[PDB]
């Protein structure tokens, strides 16, 4: 499913790009240790899943 | 060449190796932020 | 008298030189002076 692997792959990249700016701002802002706990713990599983999903899709296109 | 699937990422890949130098630079932007306390 | 913080002007100004110089090294390989 060619175009569907590029899908997952820019998902990774547009998530990394978020997670990169977001995690350090989240961490050193006192306001929302808890308002943002869920965020990062999710984007994380989301990041990982995307890596894995892109890892199996490679072996259907590459 | 990359695997043709990832070809559309070739220019991202050309710039990635210099990213660790930006960390050094980012430390000075940060100490300039905190006024070199 | 101080509405724009100094650490900001520093970053802006720096990346401005980085660009100009970056371009000079580019031109070392393109066009005039490239041996090509």
């Amino acid at each position: 499913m060619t175009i569907l692997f590029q899908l997952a792959l820019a998902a990774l990249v547009i998530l990394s790009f978020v997670m990169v700016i977001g995690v350090p701002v989240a961490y050193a802002s006192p306001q929302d240790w808890d308002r943002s706990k869920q965020l990062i713990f999710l984007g994380s599983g989301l990041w990982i899943a995307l890596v894995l999903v892109v890892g199996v899709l490679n072996f259907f296109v590459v | 060449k990359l695997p043709e699937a990832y070809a559309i990422f070739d220019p991202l890949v050309d710039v990635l190796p210099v990213i660790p130098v930006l960390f050094l630079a980012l430390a000075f932007v940060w100490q300039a932020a905190v006024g070199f306390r | 008298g101080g509405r724009i913080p100094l650490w900001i002007v520093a970053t802006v100004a720096g990346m401005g030189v980085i660009v100009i110089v970056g371009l000079f090294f580019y031109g070392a390989y393109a066009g005039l002076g490239s041996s090509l």
Partner: peptide
């Protein structure tokens, strides 16, 4: 082509100073 390269590194580069910026507004723990 090289706008591709320059637009990526444009975004990656500003990425760093932005973090510092955001964390100042929130009087973050710089």
């Amino acid at each position: 082509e090289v706008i591709a390269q320059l637009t990526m590194i444009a975004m990656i580069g500003i990425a760093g100073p932005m973090i510092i910026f955001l964390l100042a507004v929130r009087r973050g723990n710089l």
